[PDB]
Ligand binder design. Structure first.
Ligand SMILES: [Cl-]
Ligand SMILES: [Cl-]
Ligand SMILES: [Zn+2]
Ligand SMILES: [Zn+2]
Ligand SMILES: [Zn+2]
Ligand SMILES: [Zn+2]
Ligand SMILES: [Zn+2]
Ligand SMILES: [Zn+2]
Ligand SMILES: [Zn+2]
Ligand SMILES: [Zn+2]
Lengths: 342, 344, 342, 344
């Protein structure tokens, strides 16, 4: 069987920089028309000039013939000038801005201390129509890791949305039934992205019969009941949830070690993985919208013009993707997948 | 400068492995503990007396001269174990207790028990003979969330088993929950528990926040802070049916820092000092000796040790790496400075 | 090593009658606590009195100490009175009723002409909670033998189940990926039995490098892909598939001849054969459920109280089993098997 | 009764066996057929000229006086066969053709060809000399389903071989599929095929429905009815590159009715009348003579027979059994009434 869809987009991806970038860009560019490129580089993307330079590094690494456009984001920080974000948006450089968890001790050039501290930039985004992408977790030491997303909803997301009622918000990589229900019952200004790992697995898959660092990502995999809620949300054809891989590559040496980094390198296997989930939920009819229509509609962008075909032909995901000095282990490395791109 | 002198402790739950690993890890246990309950989950489980005698000899071969240490062997319960094999090992002074591993609950447990009914005849003989039952109390069904496995075992397996065999001595090994803490606290004199240093010292956030830490990954898995606090309060209260059991379970670095890391903390090198730290933090040093050196022997009907061990509140760093023949071993709290250390 | 399981049951067996019954019963009674005894004698079991008499001839032949209970079935025929099955069921004589393939030219006292013809009895079964055991094949002359099972699913099973939605149905001796999927994707009122031959072999084993009538049975062995679907179904731990040997003995003279009868005499070697299949599939943890728990659960009967132990002692299956005038050739006759009962 | 007179036919594919079996079966072929292609798969395959001459003499010894019959011998192809042995036999009038049996494809085929590359020099010499290649077209890999073996052979072996040797005469023996029927129908003048009576009269249901019938078991195996219909349609069209080849392959009853029955139908006694029946059913009796007596000779470049055989639509029963020295032989359609019979 063949599954033909309009060329999809990836509404949440990390392309890194330098040699990493050169290696990972092709996995996104071959398949996706556009991708929302997250801004969390060593020196975060907090200026139009840096965004332009990063965009060109990305373009330099796209293989010949890939019809790919990187959509850049601004990393919100306490010290960010609202005029810088405005300038970048007005010039087509910034498509959106990303809010990472607040911490009172974060350096002002590297993050936000509180939503209060950046209300002027948020208000400017509301004025201009700039989408706010949110990593919705509280990161206070006394909050259990598994409760961080639910806590954010109540302490940060709801009060923020109640104030900036015309602000477009994407609740990124949702992982709980709490978020699924909040987004489901929300208004037209609220959307969400969902990763392939949060649909395919739960915390047992990461911790039962051994510990699996390649399944370790943030927000952390939750209880089976949460996974079930996310699968049911996409299976329903809900129009405000769309594809965001959160492909977040780290070298093998940084994953398989005493303190492993959070992040699943899923760009090489994500699309076929989502196809598998939709098939298992008897929801293939809703697959195209999730991958290729819902995100564009929410962002006010046109759907892609070309097509991508997936075939139910069993292929094996490589165990390793070579980098210059180390390697990347892809999501589902070594496994035989049911759907592959034609 | 502060010195804490206690009667020589015992480790009521340890894994010594075999071969080169055994030679490397045995000394960390034998130097400090008078006796240790040696778990039977080897590649080929210890299910016969001859296997247990051979293994014990490999253990003795690796004990340095001068170490007052006696390994207490255990029998790995299986569905088809003949009650007579355990009984003669018990009479021959080979088996001190029998260990119940639910199949696939942890390391080398594919041969574990699949139902209590299947081993009921063995359990009944154990009850007659006064042989203690050591239990890894976790259900293993795929639909049960990992953090719920111990609590579920209490309701579905432990309680019914105890209602059947009312005179069987049971040790709820390495308790990790408030559920088990309360169950044991409110249980009768035939019920005891062991508690590891990691379940007192950490909770799941310490294994998952700011990075994933395979060296803190063990089974039963570290739980929510509320459980950790219940365990700390239990030991701080001087509860007499909870005692030292490290569950030291070493795996080489290559089996830990990999795509599918094995469960187990190699805590033998730092456990006693870690327990000391917890008791101090709970203002319960008055109950420390009992936990380490009296509660276990009393429950097992064994004499208390006659030698001594001194701990000093002098900073010492746990090694970053322990060499093996073709890999390395990472100790629990590797490279970290610890508050209390055992004086040589 | 040793595999200890709760005493199993055989949910589909043919014990024949007379001298053959005296010979074959011990192979079932020694190992199984209970068995569903098929009703296809020369004069089929279609009355309570005939089922009571046959049950006693079976009990007469059980060696001392076996503790075996035959569970009797009623052969469904166009002429059967619903009240006769009801009586037999209330009196504990009939445990279930068996539906053999329909044929418009079958004698009314020997079979069914169509499911329509027996709806009143099927409706009575549904009302009372009597399980329907189905030999699911269409036997029309223009249907290829390898297609008979699939054809039955679409033309008879699905419409029957859509109407009698509260009727418990056991799809007997399934042999196709079609049936495996149908049952797997079914509701709690649908179960299946699987023979050792359908797990161990495929049609090549019966027809390549010689023709092997001792592997000839109905439904016929299918292509390797079907055998693989059956092995994957039991290896998954699927709770609605259970042990049914379909042991169907015929004398050597009736098997090795110009027109050989269908049926494998597998009672003597079935349990060890299943153990080997589960071992090959790295699925021994599910072996007990298949043999001793799933069937009792579906039928609403208690699990057996005793145990059976299988050991890796490689023993040989006899070349034959003596009868009065001829002999029986067991399944895997003369072969060395990996697992045997202790 | 309708009388059908045809030019004396030939059987382009027969197994005469050896010893007592040969003495019993040769007469069934020699009485009716002017010539027969005698297959080389004896216990010790016919791979040398001297072996062929000796065998041919044993065949002649068994031919009744008055039977106008000439056995045409074949060389069993093997990986190591020297082209010179086949060439000399061809020139000496011993070998009419060479038969390719894929290793383990059928009866006495363990010494068969394992790769077309291994015998390429022989095939190239056959091409230059005009020696036809007779092929048992089935792959033998264990993973390939028996019903797909013929179709797979066309794609993986036959087509590449024919593309390599464009002037080699090839007979696709006993075709059983629509795949092969269409391949031959659409092929060039260097390709032909033989068709047995069983593949025209029956499909796999006839062998497996309501009982298992080893006497209908042959290789290539009977296929689905759609294949049978493609074969009947092919011959009914009067297609000129398909001709009579019974593949009469006798086995004693003890070798057929047993736990592992041999492949082969003993159809020589009833074949011609059986073909007559099929052609009649297809309203194709006008093409019957060509199928039986002209198409093969034309492809092989041999003259048509000069004698005659008459078939009458008088029903006769095929015997239930044929006596042998220490067993019995069951003929194709044993004990059945047949519509057409050859007139003595
Ligand atoms: Cl919870
Ligand atoms: Cl097919
Ligand atoms: Zn994030
Ligand atoms: Zn991200
Ligand atoms: Zn344990
Ligand atoms: Zn342990
Ligand atoms: Zn049947
Ligand atoms: Zn049956
Ligand atoms: Zn052939
Ligand atoms: Zn032949």
């Amino acid at each position: 069987q063949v599954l033909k869809i309009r060329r999809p987009d990836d509404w949440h991806v990390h392309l890194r920089d330098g040699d990493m970038l050169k290696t990972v860009v092709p996995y996104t560019s071959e398949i996706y028309g556009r991708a929302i490129v997250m801004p969390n580089l060593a020196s975060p993307i907090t200026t139009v000039d840096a965004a332009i330079a990063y965009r060109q590094r990305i373009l330099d690494a796209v293989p010949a013939g890939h019809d790919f456009t990187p959509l850049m984001t601004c990393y919100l920080t306490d010290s960010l000038d609202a005029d810088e974000l405005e300038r970048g948006f007005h010039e087509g450089v910034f498509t959106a801005a990303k809010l990472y968890p607040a911490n009172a001790t974060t350096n002002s050039s590297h993050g936000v201390t509180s939503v209060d501290a950046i209300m002027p930039v948020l208000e400017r985004m509301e004025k201009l129509g700039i989408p706010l992408l949110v990593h919705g977790e509280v990161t206070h030491a006394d909050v259990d890791i598994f409760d961080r997303e639910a806590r954010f909803i109540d302490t940060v997301m709801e009060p923020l949305r109640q104030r900036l009622t015309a602000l477009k918000v994407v609740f990124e990589h949702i992982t709980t039934k709490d978020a699924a229900q909040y987004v489901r019952d929300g208004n037209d200004y609220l959307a969400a992205t969902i990763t392939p790992q949060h649909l395919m697995f739960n915390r047992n898959d990461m911790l039962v019969g051994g510990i699996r660092p390649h399944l370790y990502c943030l927000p952390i995999l939750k209880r089976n009941i949460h996974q079930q809620a996310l699968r049911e949300l996409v299976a329903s054809g809900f129009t405000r949830a769309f594809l965001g891989t959160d492909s977040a590559p780290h070298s093998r040496h940084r994953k398989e070690t005493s303190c492993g980094c959070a992040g699943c390198f899923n760009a090489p296997s994500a699309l076929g993985s989502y196809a598998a989930v939709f098939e298992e939920m008897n929801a293939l009819a809703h697959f195209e919208a999730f991958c290729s229509l819902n995100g564009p509609q929410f962002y006010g962008l046109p759907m892609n013009t070309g097509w991508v075909e997936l075939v139910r032909d069993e292929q094996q995901i490589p165990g390793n993707i070579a980098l210059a000095d180390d390697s990347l282990v892809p999501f589902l490395a070594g496994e035989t997948v049911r759907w592959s791109v034609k």
